[PDB]
């Protein structure tokens, strides 16, 4: 196991960022102009799908005139970590050590 030294004046939580790739199902977005031009609710280009029929239907195709087609987007995620405290004590008397 590895040890991370938390700073002093920054609360009791740690936060880290995570970046999602393009072709992934966690990359939900709204930049969804399709191959012919239409706002659809899918901006990740069939991400994380291994079906051939589904794959050869969202491929980005281009015509000789170009145009506003095949837009994409990206997202982010965050993760957290926490802390806590522990301890215990013991007590005794003086005659116990002397007369044992």
């Amino acid at each position: 196991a590895d040890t991370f030294s938390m700073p002093k004046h920054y609360g009791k939580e740690i936060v880290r960022l995570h970046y999602i790739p393009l072709l992934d199902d966690r990359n939900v977005n709204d930049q969804g102009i399709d191959a012919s031009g239409a706002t659809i609710a899918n901006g990740n280009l069939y991400g994380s799908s291994r079906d051939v029929g589904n794959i050869t239907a969202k491929m980005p195709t281009l015509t000789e005139i170009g145009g506003r087609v095949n837009r994409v987007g990206f997202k982010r995620v965050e993760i957290k970590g926490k802390l806590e405290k522990y301890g215990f004590f013991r007590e005794y008397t003086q005659e116990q050590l002397d007369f044992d």
Binding site: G73, F74, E78
Partner: protein, 50 residues
């Protein structure tokens, strides 16, 4: 109340401090911190000296 029609809608920076979050995702810091605190001045005494 706002600007003209968008008709484009790119990856923007919609106001995250209140309401609509963002295009990329969650933010860490949404405000700068003034590190010098504002302290009121002390009062004055007129009777102690006499």
């Amino acid at each position: 109340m706002a600007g003209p029609v968008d008709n484009i809608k790119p990856m923007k920076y919609n106001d995250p401090a209140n309401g609509v979050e963002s295009s990329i995702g969650p933010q860490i810091h949404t405000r700068y911190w003034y590190k010098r605190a504002l302290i009121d001045a002390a009062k004055e005494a007129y009777f102690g000296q006499l």
